[PDB]
Short mmCIF file of N, CA and C in Angstrom, two decimals:
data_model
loop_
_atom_site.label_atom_id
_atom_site.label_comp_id
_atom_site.label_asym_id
_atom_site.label_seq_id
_atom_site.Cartn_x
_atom_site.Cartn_y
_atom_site.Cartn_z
N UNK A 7 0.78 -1.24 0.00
CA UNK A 7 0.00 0.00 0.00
C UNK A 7 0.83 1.31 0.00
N UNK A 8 1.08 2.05 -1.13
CA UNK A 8 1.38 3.33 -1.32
C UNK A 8 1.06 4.74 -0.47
N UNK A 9 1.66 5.56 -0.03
CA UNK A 9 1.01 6.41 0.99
C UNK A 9 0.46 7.57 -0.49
N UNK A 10 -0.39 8.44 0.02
CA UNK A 10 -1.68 8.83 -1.12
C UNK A 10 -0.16 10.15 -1.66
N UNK A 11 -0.72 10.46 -2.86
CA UNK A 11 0.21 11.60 -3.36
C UNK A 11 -0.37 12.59 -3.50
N UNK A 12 -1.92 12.87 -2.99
CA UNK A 12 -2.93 13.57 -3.36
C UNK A 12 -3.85 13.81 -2.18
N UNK A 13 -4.38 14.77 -1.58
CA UNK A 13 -5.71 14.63 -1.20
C UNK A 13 -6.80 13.43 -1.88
N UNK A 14 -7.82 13.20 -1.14
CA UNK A 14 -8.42 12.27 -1.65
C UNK A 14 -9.48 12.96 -2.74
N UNK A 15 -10.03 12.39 -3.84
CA UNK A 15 -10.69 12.76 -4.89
C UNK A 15 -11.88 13.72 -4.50
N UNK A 16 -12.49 13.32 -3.30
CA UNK A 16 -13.58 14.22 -3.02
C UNK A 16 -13.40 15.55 -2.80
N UNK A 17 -12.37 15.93 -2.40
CA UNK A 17 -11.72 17.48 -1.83
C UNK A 17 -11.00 18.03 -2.90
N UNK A 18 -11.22 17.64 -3.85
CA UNK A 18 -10.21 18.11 -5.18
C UNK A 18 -11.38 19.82 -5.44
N UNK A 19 -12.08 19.93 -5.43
CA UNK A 19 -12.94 21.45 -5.50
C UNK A 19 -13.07 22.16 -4.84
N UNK A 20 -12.53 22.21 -3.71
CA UNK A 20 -12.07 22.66 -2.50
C UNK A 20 -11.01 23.25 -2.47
N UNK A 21 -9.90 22.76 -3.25
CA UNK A 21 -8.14 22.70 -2.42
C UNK A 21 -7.96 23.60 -4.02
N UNK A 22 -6.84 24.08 -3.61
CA UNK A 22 -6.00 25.44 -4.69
C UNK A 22 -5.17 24.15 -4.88
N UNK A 23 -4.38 23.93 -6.47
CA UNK A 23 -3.63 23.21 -6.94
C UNK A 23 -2.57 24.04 -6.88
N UNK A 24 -2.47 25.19 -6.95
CA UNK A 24 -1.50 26.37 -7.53
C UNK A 24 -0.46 26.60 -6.23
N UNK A 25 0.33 25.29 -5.96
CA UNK A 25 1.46 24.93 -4.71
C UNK A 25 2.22 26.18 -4.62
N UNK A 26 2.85 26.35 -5.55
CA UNK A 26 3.89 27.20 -6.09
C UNK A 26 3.76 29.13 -5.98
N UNK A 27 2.23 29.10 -5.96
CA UNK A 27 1.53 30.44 -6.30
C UNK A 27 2.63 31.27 -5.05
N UNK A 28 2.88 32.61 -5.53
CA UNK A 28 3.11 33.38 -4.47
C UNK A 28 2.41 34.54 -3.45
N UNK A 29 1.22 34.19 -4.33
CA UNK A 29 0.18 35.03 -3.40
C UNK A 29 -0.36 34.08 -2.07
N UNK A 30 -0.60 35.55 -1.15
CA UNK A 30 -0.51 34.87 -0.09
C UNK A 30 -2.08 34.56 0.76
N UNK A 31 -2.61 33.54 1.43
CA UNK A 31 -3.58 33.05 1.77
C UNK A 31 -3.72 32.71 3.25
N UNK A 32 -5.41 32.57 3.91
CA UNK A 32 -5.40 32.23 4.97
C UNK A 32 -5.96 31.26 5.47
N UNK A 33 -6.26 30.15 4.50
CA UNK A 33 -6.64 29.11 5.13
C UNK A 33 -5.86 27.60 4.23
N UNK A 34 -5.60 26.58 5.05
CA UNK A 34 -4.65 25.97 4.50
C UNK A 34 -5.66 24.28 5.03
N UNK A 35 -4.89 23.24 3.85
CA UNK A 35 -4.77 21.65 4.65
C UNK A 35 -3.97 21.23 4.50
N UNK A 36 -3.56 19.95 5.28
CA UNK A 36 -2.53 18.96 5.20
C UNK A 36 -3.14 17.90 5.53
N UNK A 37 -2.66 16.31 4.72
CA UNK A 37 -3.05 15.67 4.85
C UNK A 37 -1.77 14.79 5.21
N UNK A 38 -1.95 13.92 5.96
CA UNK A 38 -0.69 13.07 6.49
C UNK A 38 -0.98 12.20 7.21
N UNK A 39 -0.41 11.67 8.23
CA UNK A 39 -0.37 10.18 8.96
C UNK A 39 -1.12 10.83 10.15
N UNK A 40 -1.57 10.21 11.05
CA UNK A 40 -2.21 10.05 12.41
C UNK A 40 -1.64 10.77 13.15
N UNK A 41 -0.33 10.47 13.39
CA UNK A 41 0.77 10.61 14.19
C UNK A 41 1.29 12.17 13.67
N UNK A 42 1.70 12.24 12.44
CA UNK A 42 2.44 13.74 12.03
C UNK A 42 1.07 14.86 12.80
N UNK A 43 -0.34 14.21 12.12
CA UNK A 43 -1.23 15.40 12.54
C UNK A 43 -1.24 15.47 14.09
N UNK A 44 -1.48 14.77 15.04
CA UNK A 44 -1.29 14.59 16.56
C UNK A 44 -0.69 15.74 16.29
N UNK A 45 0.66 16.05 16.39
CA UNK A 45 1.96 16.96 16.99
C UNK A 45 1.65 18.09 16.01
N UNK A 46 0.59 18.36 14.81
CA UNK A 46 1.44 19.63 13.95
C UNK A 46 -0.10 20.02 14.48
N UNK A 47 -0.95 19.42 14.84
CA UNK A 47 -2.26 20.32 15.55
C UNK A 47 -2.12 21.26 16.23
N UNK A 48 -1.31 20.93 17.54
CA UNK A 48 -0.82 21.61 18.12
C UNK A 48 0.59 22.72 18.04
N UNK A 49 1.47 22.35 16.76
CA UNK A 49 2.74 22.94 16.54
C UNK A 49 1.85 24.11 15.43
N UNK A 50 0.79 24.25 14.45
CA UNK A 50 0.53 24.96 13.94
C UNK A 50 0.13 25.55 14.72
N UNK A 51 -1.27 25.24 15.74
CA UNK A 51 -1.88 26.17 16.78
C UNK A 51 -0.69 27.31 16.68
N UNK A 52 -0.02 26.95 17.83
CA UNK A 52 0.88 27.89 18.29
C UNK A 52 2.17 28.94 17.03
N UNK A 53 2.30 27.76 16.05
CA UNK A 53 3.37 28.82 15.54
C UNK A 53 2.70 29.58 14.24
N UNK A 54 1.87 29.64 14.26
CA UNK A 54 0.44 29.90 13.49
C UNK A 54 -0.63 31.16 13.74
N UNK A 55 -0.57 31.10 15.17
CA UNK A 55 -1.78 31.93 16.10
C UNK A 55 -3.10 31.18 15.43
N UNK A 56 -3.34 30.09 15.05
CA UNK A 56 -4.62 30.25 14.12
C UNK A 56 -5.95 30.41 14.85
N UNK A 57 -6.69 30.94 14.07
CA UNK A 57 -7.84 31.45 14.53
C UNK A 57 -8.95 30.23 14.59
N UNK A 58 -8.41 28.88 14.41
CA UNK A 58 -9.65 27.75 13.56
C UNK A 58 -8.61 26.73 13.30
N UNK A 59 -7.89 25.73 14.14
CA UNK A 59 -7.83 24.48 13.69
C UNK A 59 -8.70 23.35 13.92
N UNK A 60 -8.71 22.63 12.75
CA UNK A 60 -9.45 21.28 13.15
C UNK A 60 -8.86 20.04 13.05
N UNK A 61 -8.88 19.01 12.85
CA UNK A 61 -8.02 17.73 12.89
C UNK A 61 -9.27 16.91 12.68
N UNK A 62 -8.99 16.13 11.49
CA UNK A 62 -9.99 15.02 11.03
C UNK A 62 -9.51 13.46 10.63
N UNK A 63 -10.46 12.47 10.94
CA UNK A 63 -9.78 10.67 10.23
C UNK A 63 -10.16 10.44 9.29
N UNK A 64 -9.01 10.22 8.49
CA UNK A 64 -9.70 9.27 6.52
C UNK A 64 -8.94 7.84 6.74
N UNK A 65 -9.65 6.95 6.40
CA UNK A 65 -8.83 5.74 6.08
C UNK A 65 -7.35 5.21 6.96
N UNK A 66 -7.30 5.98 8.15
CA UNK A 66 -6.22 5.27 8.88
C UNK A 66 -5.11 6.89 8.80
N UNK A 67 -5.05 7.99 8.30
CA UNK A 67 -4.88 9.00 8.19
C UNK A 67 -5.22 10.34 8.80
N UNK A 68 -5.06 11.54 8.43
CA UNK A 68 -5.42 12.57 9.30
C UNK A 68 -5.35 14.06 8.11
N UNK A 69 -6.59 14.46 8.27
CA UNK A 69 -6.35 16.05 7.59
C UNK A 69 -6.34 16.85 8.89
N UNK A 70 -5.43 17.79 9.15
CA UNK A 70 -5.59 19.16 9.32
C UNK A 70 -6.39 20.10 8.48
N UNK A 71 -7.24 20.82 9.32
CA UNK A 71 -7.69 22.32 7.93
C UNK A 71 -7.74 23.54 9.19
N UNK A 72 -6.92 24.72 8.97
CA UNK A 72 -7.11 25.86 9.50
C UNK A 72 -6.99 27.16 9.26
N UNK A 73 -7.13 28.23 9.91
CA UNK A 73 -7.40 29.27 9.27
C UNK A 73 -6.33 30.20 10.31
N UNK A 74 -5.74 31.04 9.59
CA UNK A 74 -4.77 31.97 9.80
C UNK A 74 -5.14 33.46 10.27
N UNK A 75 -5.23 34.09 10.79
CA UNK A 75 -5.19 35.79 11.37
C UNK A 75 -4.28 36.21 10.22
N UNK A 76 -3.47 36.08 9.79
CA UNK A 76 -2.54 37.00 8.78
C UNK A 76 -1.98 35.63 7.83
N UNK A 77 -1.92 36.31 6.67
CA UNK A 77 -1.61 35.88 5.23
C UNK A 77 -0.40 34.95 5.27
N UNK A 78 -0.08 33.77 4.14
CA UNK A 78 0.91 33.36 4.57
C UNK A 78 1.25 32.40 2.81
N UNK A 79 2.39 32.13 2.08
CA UNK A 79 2.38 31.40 1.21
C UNK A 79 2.62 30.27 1.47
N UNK A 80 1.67 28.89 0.57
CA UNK A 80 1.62 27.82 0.79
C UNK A 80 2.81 26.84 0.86
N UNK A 81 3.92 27.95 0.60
CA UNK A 81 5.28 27.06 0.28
C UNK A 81 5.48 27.05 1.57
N UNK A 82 5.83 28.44 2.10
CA UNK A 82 5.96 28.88 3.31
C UNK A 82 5.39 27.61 4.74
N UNK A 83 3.52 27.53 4.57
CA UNK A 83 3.05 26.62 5.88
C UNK A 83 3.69 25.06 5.26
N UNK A 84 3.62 24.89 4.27
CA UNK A 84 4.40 23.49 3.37
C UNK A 84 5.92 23.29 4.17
N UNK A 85 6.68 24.26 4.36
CA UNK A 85 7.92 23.86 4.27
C UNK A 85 8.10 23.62 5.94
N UNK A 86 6.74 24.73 6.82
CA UNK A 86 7.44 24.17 7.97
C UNK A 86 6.73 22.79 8.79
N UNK A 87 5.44 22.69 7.48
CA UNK A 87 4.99 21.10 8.28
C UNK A 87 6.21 20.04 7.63
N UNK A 88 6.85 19.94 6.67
CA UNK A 88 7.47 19.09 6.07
C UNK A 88 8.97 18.64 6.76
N UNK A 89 9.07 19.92 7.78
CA UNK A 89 10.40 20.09 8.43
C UNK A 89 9.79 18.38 9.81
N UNK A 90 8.86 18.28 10.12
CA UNK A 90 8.78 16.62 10.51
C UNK A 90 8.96 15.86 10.10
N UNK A 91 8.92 15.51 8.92
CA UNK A 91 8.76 14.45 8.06
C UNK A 91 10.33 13.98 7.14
N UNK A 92 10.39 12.59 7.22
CA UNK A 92 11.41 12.17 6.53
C UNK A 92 10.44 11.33 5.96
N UNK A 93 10.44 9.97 6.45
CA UNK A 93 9.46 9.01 5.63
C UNK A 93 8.11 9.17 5.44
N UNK A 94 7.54 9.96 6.48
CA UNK A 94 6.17 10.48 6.39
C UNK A 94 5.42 11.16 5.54
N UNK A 95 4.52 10.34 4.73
CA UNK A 95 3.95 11.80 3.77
C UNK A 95 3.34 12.63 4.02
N UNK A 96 2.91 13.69 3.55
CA UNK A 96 2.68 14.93 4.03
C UNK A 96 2.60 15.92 2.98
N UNK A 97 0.67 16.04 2.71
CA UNK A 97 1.04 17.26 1.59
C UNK A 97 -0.09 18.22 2.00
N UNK A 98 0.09 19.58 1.61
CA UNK A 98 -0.47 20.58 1.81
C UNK A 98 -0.41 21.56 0.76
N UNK A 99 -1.89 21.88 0.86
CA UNK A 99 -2.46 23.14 -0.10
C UNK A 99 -3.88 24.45 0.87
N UNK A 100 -3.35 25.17 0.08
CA UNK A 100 -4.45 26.39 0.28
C UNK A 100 -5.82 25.64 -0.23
N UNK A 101 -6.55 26.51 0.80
CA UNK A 101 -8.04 25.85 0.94
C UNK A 101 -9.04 26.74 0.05
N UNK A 102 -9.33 26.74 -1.02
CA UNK A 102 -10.30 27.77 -1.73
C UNK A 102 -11.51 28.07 -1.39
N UNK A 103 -12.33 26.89 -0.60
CA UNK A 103 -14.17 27.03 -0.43
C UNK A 103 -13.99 26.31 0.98
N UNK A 104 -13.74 27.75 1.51
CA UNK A 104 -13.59 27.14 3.50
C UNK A 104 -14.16 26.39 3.73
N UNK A 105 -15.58 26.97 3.93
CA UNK A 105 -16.61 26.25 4.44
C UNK A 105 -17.27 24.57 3.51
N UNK A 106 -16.79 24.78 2.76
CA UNK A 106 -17.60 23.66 1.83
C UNK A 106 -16.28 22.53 2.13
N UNK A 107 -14.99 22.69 2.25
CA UNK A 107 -14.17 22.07 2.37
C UNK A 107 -14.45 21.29 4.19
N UNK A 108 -14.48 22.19 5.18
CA UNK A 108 -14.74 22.15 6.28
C UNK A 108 -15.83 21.00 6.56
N UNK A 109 -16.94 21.59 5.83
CA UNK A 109 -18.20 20.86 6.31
C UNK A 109 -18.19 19.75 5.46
N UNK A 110 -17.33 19.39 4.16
CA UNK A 110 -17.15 17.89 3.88
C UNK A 110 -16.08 17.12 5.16
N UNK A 111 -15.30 17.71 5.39
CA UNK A 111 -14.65 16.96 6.75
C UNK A 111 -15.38 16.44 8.09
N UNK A 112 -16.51 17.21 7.75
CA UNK A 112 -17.22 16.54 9.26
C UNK A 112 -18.71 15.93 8.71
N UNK A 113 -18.68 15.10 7.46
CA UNK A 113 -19.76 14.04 7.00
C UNK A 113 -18.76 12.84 6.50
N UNK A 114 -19.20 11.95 6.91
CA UNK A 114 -18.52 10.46 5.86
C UNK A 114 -18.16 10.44 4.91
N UNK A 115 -17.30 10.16 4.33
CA UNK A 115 -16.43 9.52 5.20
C UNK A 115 -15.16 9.84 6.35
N UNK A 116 -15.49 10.91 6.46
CA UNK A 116 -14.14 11.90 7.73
C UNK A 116 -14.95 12.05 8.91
N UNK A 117 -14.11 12.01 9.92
CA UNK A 117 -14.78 12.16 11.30
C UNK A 117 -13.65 13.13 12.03
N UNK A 118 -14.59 13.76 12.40
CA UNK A 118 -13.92 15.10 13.55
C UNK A 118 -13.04 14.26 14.47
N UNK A 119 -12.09 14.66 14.84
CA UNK A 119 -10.70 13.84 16.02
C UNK A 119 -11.02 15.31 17.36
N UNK A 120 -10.72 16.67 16.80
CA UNK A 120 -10.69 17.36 17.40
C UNK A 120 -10.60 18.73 16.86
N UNK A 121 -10.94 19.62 17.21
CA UNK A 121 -10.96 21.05 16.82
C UNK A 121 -11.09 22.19 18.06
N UNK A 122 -10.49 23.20 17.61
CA UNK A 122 -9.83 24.45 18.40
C UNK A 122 -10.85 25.32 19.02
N UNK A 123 -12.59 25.71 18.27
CA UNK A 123 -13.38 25.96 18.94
C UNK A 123 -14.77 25.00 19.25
N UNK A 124 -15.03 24.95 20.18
CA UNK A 124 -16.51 24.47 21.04
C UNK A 124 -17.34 24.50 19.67
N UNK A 125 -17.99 23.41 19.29
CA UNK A 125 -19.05 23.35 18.41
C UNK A 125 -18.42 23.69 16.76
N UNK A 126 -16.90 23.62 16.89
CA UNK A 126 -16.68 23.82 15.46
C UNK A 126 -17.23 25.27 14.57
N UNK A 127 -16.91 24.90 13.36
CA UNK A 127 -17.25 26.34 12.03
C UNK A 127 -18.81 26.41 11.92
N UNK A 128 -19.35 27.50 12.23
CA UNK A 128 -20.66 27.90 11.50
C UNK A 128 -20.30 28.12 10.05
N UNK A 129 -21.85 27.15 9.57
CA UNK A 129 -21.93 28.17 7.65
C UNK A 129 -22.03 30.24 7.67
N UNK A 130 -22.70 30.54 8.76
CA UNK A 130 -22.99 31.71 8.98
C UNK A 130 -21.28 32.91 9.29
N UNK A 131 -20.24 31.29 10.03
CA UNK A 131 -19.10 32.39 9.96
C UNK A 131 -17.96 32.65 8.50
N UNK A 132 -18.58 32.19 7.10
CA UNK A 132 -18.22 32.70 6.08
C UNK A 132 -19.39 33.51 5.29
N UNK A 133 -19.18 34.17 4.33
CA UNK A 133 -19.75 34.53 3.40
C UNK A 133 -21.05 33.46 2.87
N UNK A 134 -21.65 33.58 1.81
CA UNK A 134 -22.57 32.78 1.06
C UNK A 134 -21.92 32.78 0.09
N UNK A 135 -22.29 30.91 -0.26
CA UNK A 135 -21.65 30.91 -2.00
C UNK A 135 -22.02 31.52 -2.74
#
């Protein structure tokens, strides 16, 4: 069994492909092992300030998705989750449709592990599509 090279297919309308972009953004995911997310939940919290982490289970796996107070490039949150990882995979992209991304993480097949505020994201705390 191969570790994934991709987010999983369902979140592909959600996630910015544009790794490389240098404009800068405030909401991000990573997808990785059980274990990497455990420790970067808490290592983003803090080196992050974020305003909104959550931590979710796929298939024996773990997404992170959170949201930033100030702007940041994806290479940039990329390079310092990757600074864990040797054998571990671990990939991350800017999040384009917060909420739609969000609220697929907390229906099946993903289950909430844990998140930063009481009762999680309102639809009401973004915009309307």
């Amino acid at each position: 069994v191969e570790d994934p090279k991709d987010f999983p297919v369902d979140l592909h309308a959600f996630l910015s492909q544009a790794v490389f972009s240098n404009r800068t953004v405030a909401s991000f995911a990573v997808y990785t092992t059980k274990e990497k997310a455990q420790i970067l939940y808490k290592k983003l919290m803090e080196k992050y300030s974020v305003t909104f982490i959550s931590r979710h289970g796929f298939g024996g796996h773990n997404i992170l998705f959170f949201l930033t107070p100030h702007r940041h490039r994806v290479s940039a949150i990329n390079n310092y989750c990757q600074k864990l990882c040797t054998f571990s995979f671990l990939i991350c992209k800017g999040v384009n449709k917060e909420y739609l991304f969000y609220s697929a993480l907390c229906r099946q097949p993903y289950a909430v592990v844990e998140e930063s505020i009481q009762g999680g994201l309102k639809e009401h705390d973004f915009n309307p599509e």
